[PDB]
Amino acid sequence: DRPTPLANIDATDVEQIYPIESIIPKKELQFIRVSSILKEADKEKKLELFPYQNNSKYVAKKLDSLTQPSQMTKLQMLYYLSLLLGVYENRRVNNKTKLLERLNSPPEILVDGILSRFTVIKPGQFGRSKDRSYFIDPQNEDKILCYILAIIMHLDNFIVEITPLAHELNLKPSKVVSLFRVLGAIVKGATVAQAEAFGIPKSTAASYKIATMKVPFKL
C-alpha cells in the first residue's frame, strides 16, 4: 500500500495517468452500475441512488453535467467518490456493520475493498469471527483523500481550484496543495485564462492556487 493510486508514468493522455482501474480495481468496478442514474430524470431521485448522502451540494453539482452514456466512466467515479466521502466523514466508525449503517446500501464488495486498502485492520481471529474491525489513522486519511482528489481531477477536467475544494473537505488549503503534490499534480498560481474562467480578479491570479495534471507525467 502507497498513498496514491498506481500512476501510469507512460500515459499519453492526462485521463490515463490515474485510469479508473487504478482508482477502483476491475473486480470491484464491475459492481458500480450507473445506468439507473443516467435513466433517472428527476435530480432529487438521481441523488438518492448514490451510496452516501449528507448536507453537501458537491456531488449534486458534479452530477448535473453527467447525462450521456459516453460519461459512464466519470459517473462510476462520482459514485465511488460519494462512497469515499461517506467513509471519510464517518472515519471515527471502527467496524464494518456500524459503517454500513451510515451508508446508503453500497455493494458490500466496495466497502470490503475500502476496509482492506484504506484502514488499519484490528487483527485477531476472535474479533474476525464477530465482524471486520479497523481504525483510520493519519496515513490512511491521506490515502482516502488522494483517491478522492484523483477522481476530482477526472471530474474537473484536470484543472482544480484549491480554495473551494479545501472548504468542501474541511482541510487547510496547504493540506490540499500538499496532497495534490503527492499525486504529482502541478500546483501554482492561476494563469490569466484560468482566472477569467474561475471568475477571480486578474491581479489576484498568481496568488489563487490551481492544481493541474499534464502529460508527460513527472518522473
C-alpha cell at 48: 438518492
Q: What domain range includes position 204? A: 1-219
Query: What's the grid cell of residue 172?
Result: 487547510
C-alpha cell recorded at residue 188: 501554482
Distance CA 189, CA 88 (A): 28
The CA dihedral of 65, 67, 70, 76, to the nearest 10 degrees, is 80
How many domains are there within the chain? Answer: 1
Q: Beta 209-212 vs 159-161: how paired, if at all?
A: antiparallel
Query: At what resolution in Å was this solved?
Result: 1.9
**3-state helix/strand/coil string of the chain:** CCCCCCCCCCCCCHHHCCCHHHHCCHHHHCCCCCHHHHHCCCHHHHHHCCCCCCCCCHHHHHHCCCCCHHHHHHHHHHHHHHHHHHHHHCCCCCEHHHHHCCCCCCCHHHHHHHHHHHCEECCCHHHHHHCCEEECCHHHHHHHHHHHHHHHHHHCCCEEEHHHHHHHHCCCHHHHHHHHHHCCCEEEECCHHHHHHHCCCHHHHHHCEEEECCCCCCC
Residue carrying C-alpha cell 447525462: 67
Q: Which conformational region is residue 121 in: left (phi greater than 0), alpha (psi within -120 to 50 degrees), or beta?
A: beta
Q: How far is CA 165 from CA 62, 174, 212, in A?
A: 13, 11, 14
Beta bridge partners of 189: 209
Residue 90 to residue 44: CA distance in whole angstroms: 23
Q: What is the experimental method?
A: X-ray
- Write b or e for each residue in 10-44: b if 16 or more Cβ atoms lie within 10 A of its Cβ, otherwise e: ebeebbebbbbebbbeeebbeebebeebeeeeeee
Amino acid at position 109, single letter: I
Residue 142 contacts residue 149 (beta carbons within 8 Å): no
Instruction: List all residues 6 or more positions away from 84 whose beta carbon is below 8 Å from its beta carbon.
Output: 114, 144, 147, 148, 151
Nearest alpha-carbon partner for 5 in 152, 159, 186: 152
Which three cell numbers mark 41? 430524470
